[PDB]
C-alpha cells in the first residue's frame, strides 16, 4: 500500500534522503558536506567529458590538451570546470573538516575515520590528476614529490623505482598515474556511501552540539530545498570564478610543455598542498620531513582521544575556540610560508608554526579543556 515503504530500495532512500530525521537548528556549515556531495559528481562527469580526449602518453598528451582548450565545442568550459571545480572541491572540503572538528562531529568515531581515509584518498587523486595535464610543474613536481619516499632507509627508494616503471617520468609513469587517478574517485564514492551509512545510524550532529533527538525534523520538506539553495550559490562561486577568473586559481608553468631538460625557477606545488609542502621545509633530514608530512594528516585521529572538554562542540567555549583560531591561523601561516620561495626567516617562522601546530592539540587543547572543566565542576 505505502509506496515509499513498498519497494525496499525506496525503503532505504526513505530511511535517508527522503525523510531521515534531522536536527532543525542546522546552519550552512552542515550544508557544506552536502556541497562536497554536490561537487563530486560534477567533477566526475566533467572528467568524463575530459576523458574523451586526453591521452596518457609522454608525448601525445599535451597536444590533446590543446585539442581540448581550442578544438572542443565549449570543452574549455569543461576543462576549467574540472580544474577550478576540483579547486572548489578542496575549498568546501576544508570548511567541512573545520566543521567536523569544530562542532565535534568527530565524536562519531568510525564515521570520522572513514572521513580520514576518504581524505587521504582525495589527496592522492589530487596529486596524480595534477600530474596528468603534462607540463613543467607536472613533470618536475611529480618527480620531486615522488622523490620523498626515497627517504626510507631501504624500501622507499626501491618503491619510487617501482612507481615510475622506469628510470624517470615517462609514458610508463604517466599512464600509471592516469590509471590510479581514474580508479580512486570511484572508490571515493563507495567510501562516501559507507560514510553516510555510518552517519544515519548514529544520528546527525547539531550546531548546539548537545543532542537534539527531541527536536528531530523531517528532511525532505526542509533541508532538501536548503541544500539546493546552497548548491546553487556554490554554482555562483564556481561559475564566477571560471567565466571571470579563468586562470588565476592554479600555477602557470604547466602551460609550458614539460622538459626533463629545461628546469623551472621555483616549482611551487599547487596551493592546497602548500602547507604540507611547507612542512617539507620544516626540519633537517628528509626522512623526518616525510614523517611529519604524513603526521600532519594522521594527527587528526588523536583528537577524539585528545578531546575531553564536556562540549561535544566548540561554540559555547570561546576559550578553546581561541586556541582553535590560533590553530587555523597557524594553518594560514604554513600556507603562505609554503607559497613563497625558500628563505631563512620563512624557515624559522615555519619551524615554530609547525611545533605550535602540533602542540595546540597535543598540549594546549586537552589541558585547557581540563582547567575549563575545573572552573565549572566538570
Amino acid at each position: 500500500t505505502n509506496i515509499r515503504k513498498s519497494h525496499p530500495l525506496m525503503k532505504i532512500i526513505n530511511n535517508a534522503f527522503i525523510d531521515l530525521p534531522a536536527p532543525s537548528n542546522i546552519s550552512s556549515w552542515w550544508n557544506f558536506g552536502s556541497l562536497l556531495g554536490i561537487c563530486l559528481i560534477l567533477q566526475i562527469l566533467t572528467g568524463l567529458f575530459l576523458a574523451m580526449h586526453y591521452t596518457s602518453d609522454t608525448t601525445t598528451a599535451f597536444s590533446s590538451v590543446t585539442h581540448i582548450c581550442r578544438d572542443v565545442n565549449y570543452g574549455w568550459v569543461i576543462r576549467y570546470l574540472h580544474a577550478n571545480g576540483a579547486s572548489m572541491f578542496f575549498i568546501c572540503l576544508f570548511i567541512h573538516v573545520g566543521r567536523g572538528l569544530y562542532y565535534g562531529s568527530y565524536m562519531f568515531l568510525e564515521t570520522w575515520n572513514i572521513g580520514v581515509v576518504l581524505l587521504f584518498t582525495v589527496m592522492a587523486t589530487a596529486f596524480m590528476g595534477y600530474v596528468l595535464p603534462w607540463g613543467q610543474m607536472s613533470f618536475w613536481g611529480a618527480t620531486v614529490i615522488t622523490n620523498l619516499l626515497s627517504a626510507i632507509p631501504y624500501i622507499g627508494t626501491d618503491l619510487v623505482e617501482w612507481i615510475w616503471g622506469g628510470f624517470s617520468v615517462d609514458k610508463a609513469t604517466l599512464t600509471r598515474f592516469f590509471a590510479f587517478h581514474f580508479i580512486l574517485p570511484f572508490i571515493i564514492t563507495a567510501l562516501a556511501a559507507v560514510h553516510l551509512l555510518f552517519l544515519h545510524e548514529t544520528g546527525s550532529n547539531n550546531p548546539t552540539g548537545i543532542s537534539s533527538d527531541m527536536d528531530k525534523i523531517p528532511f525532505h520538506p526542509y533541508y532538501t530545498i536548503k541544500d539546493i539553495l546552497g548548491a546553487l550559490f556554490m554554482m555562483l562561486i564556481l561559475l564566477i570564478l571560471v567565466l571571470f577568473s579563468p586562470d588565476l586559481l592554479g600555477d602557470p608553468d604547466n602551460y609550458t610543455p614539460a622538459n626533463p631538460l629545461n628546469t623551472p625557477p621555483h616549482i611551487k606545488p599547487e596551493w592546497y598542498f602548500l602547507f604540507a609542502y611547507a612542512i617539507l621545509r620544516s626540519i633537517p633530514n628528509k626522512l623526518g620531513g616525510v614523517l611529519a608530512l604524513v603526521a600532519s594528516i594522521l594527527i587528526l585521529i588523536l583528537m577524539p582521544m585528545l578531546h575531553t572538554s564536556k562540549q561535544r562542540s566548540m561554540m559555547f567555549r570561546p576559550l578553546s575556540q581561541c586556541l582553535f583560531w590560533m590553530l587555523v591561523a597557524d594553518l594560514i601561516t604554513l600556507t603562505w610560508i609554503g607559497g613563497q620561495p625558500v628563505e631563512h626567516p620563512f624557515i624559522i617562522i615555519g619551524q615554530l608554526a609547525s611545533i605550535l601546530y602540533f602542540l595546540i592539540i597535543l598540549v594546549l587543547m586537552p589541558i585547557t579543556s581540563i582547567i575549563e572543566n575545573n572552573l565549572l565542576k566538570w
Binding site: 520538506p221 536548503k226 539546493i228 602557470p252 608553468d253 602551460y255 625557477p265
Partner: protein
C-alpha cells in the same frame, strides 16, 4: 640570487571585468605576426582556424592561408611538396627542428607564442614590458656578446635582438607604426592567441550573472517560504500538576 625586475601592471582595455578584447588591435597585431613575427618561436598549436571568425571571411581566411605553405606529406610515392594554402593548414613550421633555432640562437630556444601570456607571471603585460625593456647595462656588470641586456629577462640579458624598432612594419590598414602602438598590437594579438575563446567567454559569463541574480533571490524566497513554518512557531509548556 639576483632579482628579476617586477613589471608594473598597466591598464589595458580588456582588463575591465566587463571588458572584451577588440578584433582591431588583434588584427593589426596579426599583421605584426604575418611578417616580422616569423623569427620563431612558434604558434603551431593554432592553425588558420580561429582566424576566420575574428576578422576573416572563409575565402579570405584561405586567402590569408596561402600566403605561406607548409609541406604536403608524401602520397602514393610523390613525397614532399607544397600545398597552396587552405586555412586548415597550420602556421609555418618555425624550423625543421628547434635545435636548428638553438644553433641559430646560442642554444637558447625561442619559446612558442601560444602560452607565453598564460605561462609567464605578469603575463601579457610582461610580454609588452620585455619588448620595451632594453635598458643599457650599468657599469661593472658582465654580458655575453650575443646578449642584449634587458632587466625584464630574469637573467637580465636576453639573447634576443630587439625585433621592434621605430616604424617596424607599415600596416595594410595604413595606421602609424610607433614601437609602442605596434607592440600593443603585438601583445593584444598574443592575448588573442593566448585565449581564443575570451571575447566569446565574457558574453557567456555576463549572461550567467543575470541568471544567477534572478535565481539567487527567488530560490531563497522559497527557502523562506518553507522554513517560515518553523521560524514562526510558538511553543508552550503546561505542567499537568
Amino acid at each position: 640570487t639576483d632579482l628579476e625586475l617586477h613589471a608594473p601592471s598597466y591598464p589595458w582595455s580588456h582588463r575591465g571585468l566587463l571588458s572584451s578584447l577588440d578584433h582591431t588591435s588583434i588584427r593589426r597585431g596579426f599583421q605584426v605576426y604575418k611578417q616580422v613575427c616569423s623569427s620563431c618561436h612558434s604558434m603551431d598549436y593554432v592553425a588558420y582556424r580561429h582566424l576566420v571568425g575574428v576578422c576573416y571571411t572563409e575565402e579570405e581566411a584561405k586567402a590569408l592561408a596561402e600566403e605561406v605553405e607548409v609541406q604536403d606529406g608524401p602520397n602514393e610515392d610523390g613525397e614532399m611538396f607544397m600545398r597552396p594554402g587552405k586555412l586548415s593548414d597550420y602556421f609555418p613550421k618555425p624550423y625543421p627542428n628547434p635545435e636548428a633555432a638553438r644553433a641559430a640562437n646560442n642554444g637558447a630556444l625561442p619559446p612558442d607564442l601560444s602560452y607565453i601570456v598564460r605561462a609567464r607571471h605578469g603575463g601579457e603585460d610582461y610580454v609588452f614590458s620585455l619588448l620595451t625593456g632594453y635598458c643599457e647595462p650599468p657599469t661593472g656588470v658582465s654580458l655575453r656578446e650575443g646578449l642584449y641586456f634587458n632587466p625584464y629577462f630574469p637573467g637580465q640579458a636576453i639573447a634576443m635582438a630587439p625585433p621592434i624598432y621605430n616604424e617596424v612594419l607599415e600596416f595594410d590598414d595604413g595606421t602609424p607604426a610607433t614601437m609602442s602602438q605596434v607592440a600593443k598590437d603585438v601583445c593584444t594579438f598574443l592575448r588573442w592567441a593566448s585565449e581564443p575563446e575570451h571575447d566569446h567567454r565574457k558574453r557567456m559569463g555576463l549572461k550567467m550573472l543575470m541568471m544567477m541574480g534572478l535565481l539567487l533571490p527567488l530560490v531563497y524566497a522559497m527557502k523562506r517560504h518553507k522554513w517560515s513554518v518553523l521560524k514562526s512557531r510558538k511553543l508552550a509548556y503546561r505542567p499537568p500538576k
